[PDB]
């Protein structure tokens, strides 16, 4: 039903046949491919105005000279990848094909990278690519064995975090199907901050370090709140060398009525599965902008498991520590 220029086509084909030595078929195929590409670009333009991917999720650039479309998605993604799609004429079949240019998709098995029938189900193809990329990232995370597998939901990752000393509970992290930023179900301000930190993270080692620090400072915050709800911590003291007892964190607490320069020192040792606390008494001074460990006691190191610490133990320690 397209308004074809019938007479101009007549003269053009007659001239081609007169100058022909084949060429008409090649020109017709090229024009058909160009028209299909142009209408695909027009569909992209129509969808982008009101589509789910309008807010910087998808960007498409079309070149008529090379007759190819480059699509970039997930601009705010630095997980050692950049979401790129190329739509162009296949040399072997002389047909327009869509290729998801990704090495992760390249070595992925039982997963097609090239798709046809773009006009009919471009949205379905985009959704399939989105889900496949999310599944590949999730499978990499599971292979690193940082997040346990959720049986109920295949798109939800479980992260094990101790809410209290004895509690050991999972938190559900989910992947946005549009832009691809990890998010929590009911994030706390610290949880939201570290989710944002995860979002712009770049390396798998960086992600693992981020999660390790998340567990560590979550425990630190829990115990610091426990102390403050009953204790004056110090957020100013930085020692050049960590105290000899796997992540070690030193916390220096005291009370206003204590003797000067005498601090209760807690060395928190966090492992992949277990955490312990070394409670000692030390003397530290500040001289010319430096923190000097004047004295440390090792014969009376209290090595205590994380779970056993409770409020009553805290107050009994407060009474005995003087």
């Amino acid at each position: 039903n397209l308004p074809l220029n019938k007479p101009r086509l007549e003269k053009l084909i007659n001239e081609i046949l007169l100058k022909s030595n084949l060429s008409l078929y090649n020109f017709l195929h090229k024009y058909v491919l160009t028209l299909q590409l142009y209408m695909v670009h027009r569909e992209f333009l129509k969808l982008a105005n009101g589509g789910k991917f309008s807010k910087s999720n998808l960007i498409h650039n079309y070149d008529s000279k090379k007759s190819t479309i480059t699509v970039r998605y997930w601009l705010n993604g630095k997980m050692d990848s950049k979401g790129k799609i190329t739509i162009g004429i296949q040399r072997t079949t002389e047909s327009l094909i869509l290729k998801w240019d990704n090495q992760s998709a390249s070595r992925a098995k039982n997963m097609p990278v090239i798709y046809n029938n773009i006009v009919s189900n471009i949205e379905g193809i985009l959704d399939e690519i989105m889900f496949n990329h999310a599944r590949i990232i999730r499978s990499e995370l599971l292979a690193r064995d940082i997040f346990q597998e959720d049986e109920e939901n295949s798109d939800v990752l479980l992260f094990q975090l101790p809410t209290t000393c004895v509690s050991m509970a999972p938190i559900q992290l989910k992947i946005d199907l549009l832009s691809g930023q990890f998010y929590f179900r009911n994030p706390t301000p610290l949880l939201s901050n570290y989710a944002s930190k995860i979002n712009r993270a770049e390396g798998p080692e960086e992600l693992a370090r981020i999660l390790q620090q998340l567990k560590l400072d979550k425990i630190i915050h829990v115990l610091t709140t426990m102390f403050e709800n009953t204790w004056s911590c110090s957020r100013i003291i930085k020692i050049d060398k960590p105290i000899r007892t796997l992540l070690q964190r030193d916390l220096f607490i005291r009370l206003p009525h204590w003797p000067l320069n005498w601090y209760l020192i807690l060395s928190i040792i966090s492992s992949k599965t277990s955490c312990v606390v070394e409670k000692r008494i030390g003397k530290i001074v500040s001289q010319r902008g430096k923190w000097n460990l004047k004295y440390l006691d090792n014969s009376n190191v209290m090595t205590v498991k994380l779970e056993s610490i409770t409020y009553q133990k805290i107050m009994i320690l407060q009474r005995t520590i003087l």
Binding site: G50, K52, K55, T163, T164, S167, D176, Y183, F184, R185, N186, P187, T188, P189, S192, T225, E228, N229, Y311, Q312
Partner: protein, 323 residues
Amino acid sequence: GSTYKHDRGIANIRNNIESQNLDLIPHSSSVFKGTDFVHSVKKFLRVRIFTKIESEDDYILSGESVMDRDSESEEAETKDIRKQIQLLKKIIFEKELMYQIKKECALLISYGVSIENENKVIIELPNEKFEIELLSLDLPKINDKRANLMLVMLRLLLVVIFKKTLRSRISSPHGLINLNVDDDILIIRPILGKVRFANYKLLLKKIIKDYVLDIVPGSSITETEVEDDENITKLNKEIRAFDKLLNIPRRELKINLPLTEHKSPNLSLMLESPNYCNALIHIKFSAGTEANAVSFDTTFSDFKEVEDFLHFIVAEYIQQKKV
């Protein structure tokens, strides 16, 4: 005051040759050329409320917005221009409302709000489901009044947004009127905050009853809430009239424990939702020593830690009563 740039709200007047009447043709809808324009373009906004059953994960339709129709007199409507004008105003207002709802809820994914399609949005609550849909025309339940009320307050909030925009525009010329999604657009935030605040209030009531009322008899609980030119003053008055709805919900609960030896500790717990979704519980426990010597004053964002500290406080009070 509307910032909706998609449509200009311009209608051409056409004298109908056949019926000798007057009709209005909008600028945008230039594709439908026929006498079925009225039904083809008649869109509406529907609110559906589903109640989650405690025995199954499925949701049952418990309420729906009542579609009261003023178009029953079709012959009168097709010849009265004023009715067409009112219908077009309603249509454009609903379109703007739906667009604003989309742009507002696009940022509430982290709290259990999702968008199904270009015309549907879904809000989930531990016991309820809300669906807002834009649908074309082509037994009284319990929650039908609820959905009608929801629609009414959504329209009211959109009107308040328009009034705020106009007041800001009149106040100063230099200020570029570019609405901020984080600040200006406040439509689903107040309703969602009220509902979730009620849910958290019920949960904390249950927790306090289980851990204090059931353990320590005689506790007394009190519930409290803590708050030139004619045109500018008129707008200020009209906007201030909606403070009780737009303002952040708050609650305070004072618990007085009956103790002897003229030593009566107080437990004041104030619950707030600073960002309209998160629950913040501030606890002030004053031991029976002095009127200003607050024994403890803490804040909590996790209900589990709230319960743990409540249990610790109960144990400490029991020990004090035992000494």
